[PDB]
Short mmCIF file of all heavy atoms in Angstrom, two decimals:
data_model
loop_
_atom_site.label_atom_id
_atom_site.label_comp_id
_atom_site.label_asym_id
_atom_site.label_seq_id
_atom_site.Cartn_x
_atom_site.Cartn_y
_atom_site.Cartn_z
N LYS N 61 52.28 -20.45 23.34
CA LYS N 61 52.95 -19.23 23.83
C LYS N 61 52.12 -17.97 23.51
O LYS N 61 52.21 -16.97 24.22
CB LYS N 61 54.38 -19.07 23.25
CG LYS N 61 55.36 -20.20 23.59
N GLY N 63 48.71 -18.05 23.21
CA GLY N 63 47.37 -18.27 23.73
C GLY N 63 46.37 -18.77 22.71
O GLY N 63 45.18 -18.70 22.95
N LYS N 65 44.98 -21.86 19.85
CA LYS N 65 44.74 -23.31 19.76
C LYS N 65 44.42 -23.75 18.34
O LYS N 65 43.62 -24.68 18.14
CB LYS N 65 43.60 -23.72 20.69
CG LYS N 65 43.86 -23.60 22.17
CD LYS N 65 42.59 -23.93 22.97
CE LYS N 65 42.89 -24.92 24.11
NZ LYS N 65 42.15 -24.75 25.41
N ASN N 68 41.06 -24.71 16.91
CA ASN N 68 40.13 -24.48 18.01
C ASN N 68 40.16 -23.06 18.54
O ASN N 68 39.67 -22.81 19.63
CB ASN N 68 40.39 -25.52 19.10
CG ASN N 68 39.88 -26.87 18.68
OD1 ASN N 68 38.68 -27.14 18.72
ND2 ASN N 68 40.78 -27.70 18.18
N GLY N 69 40.69 -22.13 17.76
CA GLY N 69 40.50 -20.72 18.01
C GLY N 69 41.77 -20.02 18.44
O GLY N 69 42.77 -20.67 18.77
N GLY N 70 41.70 -18.69 18.42
CA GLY N 70 42.85 -17.84 18.71
C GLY N 70 42.49 -16.37 18.71
O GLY N 70 41.32 -16.01 18.61
N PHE N 71 43.52 -15.53 18.81
CA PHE N 71 43.38 -14.09 18.83
C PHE N 71 44.19 -13.51 17.69
O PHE N 71 45.33 -13.94 17.44
CB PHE N 71 43.94 -13.49 20.13
CG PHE N 71 43.34 -14.04 21.40
CD1 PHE N 71 43.98 -15.03 22.12
CD2 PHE N 71 42.15 -13.54 21.88
CE1 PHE N 71 43.44 -15.51 23.29
CE2 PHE N 71 41.60 -14.02 23.05
CZ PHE N 71 42.24 -15.01 23.76
N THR N 74 47.57 -11.76 19.16
CA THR N 74 48.73 -12.61 19.39
C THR N 74 49.25 -13.25 18.12
O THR N 74 50.43 -13.66 18.08
CB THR N 74 48.49 -13.69 20.45
OG1 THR N 74 47.50 -14.63 20.01
CG2 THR N 74 48.07 -13.02 21.77
N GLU N 116 45.57 -1.89 19.24
CA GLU N 116 44.21 -2.25 19.64
C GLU N 116 43.38 -0.99 19.79
O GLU N 116 43.89 0.03 20.27
CB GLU N 116 44.18 -3.01 20.95
CG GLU N 116 44.96 -4.31 20.91
CD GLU N 116 44.73 -5.22 22.12
OE1 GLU N 116 43.62 -5.82 22.26
OE2 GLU N 116 45.69 -5.38 22.90
N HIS N 165 34.29 -15.08 16.60
CA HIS N 165 34.66 -15.36 15.24
C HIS N 165 35.42 -14.15 14.72
O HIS N 165 34.93 -13.05 14.84
CB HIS N 165 33.39 -15.63 14.44
CG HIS N 165 33.61 -15.98 13.00
ND1 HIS N 165 34.19 -17.16 12.60
CD2 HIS N 165 33.28 -15.33 11.86
CE1 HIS N 165 34.22 -17.22 11.29
NE2 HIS N 165 33.67 -16.12 10.81
N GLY N 166 36.60 -14.37 14.16
CA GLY N 166 37.44 -13.29 13.63
C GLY N 166 37.11 -13.01 12.16
O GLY N 166 36.97 -13.95 11.37
N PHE N 212 36.73 -5.75 20.12
CA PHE N 212 38.18 -5.92 20.07
C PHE N 212 38.79 -5.77 18.67
O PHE N 212 39.26 -6.75 18.10
CB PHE N 212 38.59 -7.26 20.72
CG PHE N 212 38.14 -7.38 22.13
CD1 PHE N 212 37.00 -8.13 22.45
CD2 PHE N 212 38.81 -6.69 23.15
CE1 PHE N 212 36.57 -8.21 23.77
CE2 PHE N 212 38.38 -6.77 24.47
CZ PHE N 212 37.25 -7.52 24.78
C1 LIG U 1 50.54 -14.18 25.31
N1 LIG U 1 49.14 -14.14 25.57
C2 LIG U 1 48.36 -13.06 25.34
O1 LIG U 1 48.73 -11.99 24.89
N2 LIG U 1 47.07 -13.43 25.73
C3 LIG U 1 45.93 -12.53 25.61
C4 LIG U 1 46.02 -11.37 26.53
C5 LIG U 1 45.27 -10.19 25.98
N3 LIG U 1 44.09 -10.61 25.23
C6 LIG U 1 43.18 -9.47 25.01
C7 LIG U 1 42.91 -9.06 23.58
C8 LIG U 1 41.56 -8.47 23.55
N4 LIG U 1 40.48 -9.51 23.43
C9 LIG U 1 39.71 -9.84 24.50
N5 LIG U 1 38.76 -10.71 24.49
C10 LIG U 1 38.50 -11.38 23.29
C11 LIG U 1 39.22 -11.12 22.14
C12 LIG U 1 38.94 -11.83 20.92
C13 LIG U 1 39.14 -11.23 19.69
C14 LIG U 1 38.88 -11.90 18.53
C15 LIG U 1 38.41 -13.19 18.58
CL1 LIG U 1 38.09 -14.00 17.08
C16 LIG U 1 38.18 -13.84 19.78
C17 LIG U 1 37.67 -15.24 19.83
N6 LIG U 1 38.69 -16.17 20.23
C18 LIG U 1 38.45 -17.20 21.05
O2 LIG U 1 37.34 -17.43 21.52
C19 LIG U 1 39.59 -18.06 21.37
C20 LIG U 1 39.43 -19.44 21.39
C21 LIG U 1 40.49 -20.26 21.69
C22 LIG U 1 41.70 -19.68 21.97
F1 LIG U 1 42.75 -20.48 22.27
C23 LIG U 1 41.90 -18.33 21.97
C24 LIG U 1 40.83 -17.52 21.66
C25 LIG U 1 38.46 -13.14 20.95
C26 LIG U 1 40.31 -10.11 22.19
O3 LIG U 1 41.04 -9.79 21.25
C27 LIG U 1 44.47 -11.33 24.00
C28 LIG U 1 45.73 -12.13 24.18
C29 LIG U 1 47.07 -14.72 26.18
C30 LIG U 1 46.04 -15.50 26.66
C31 LIG U 1 46.34 -16.78 27.05
CL2 LIG U 1 45.05 -17.79 27.67
C32 LIG U 1 47.65 -17.29 26.98
C33 LIG U 1 48.68 -16.49 26.49
C34 LIG U 1 48.36 -15.19 26.10
#
Side-chain angles (χ1 to χ4, degrees), residues 63 65 68-71 74 116 165-166 212:
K65 292 175 132 144
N68 287 283
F71 303 98
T74 66
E116 300 191 71
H165 182 68
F212 302 101

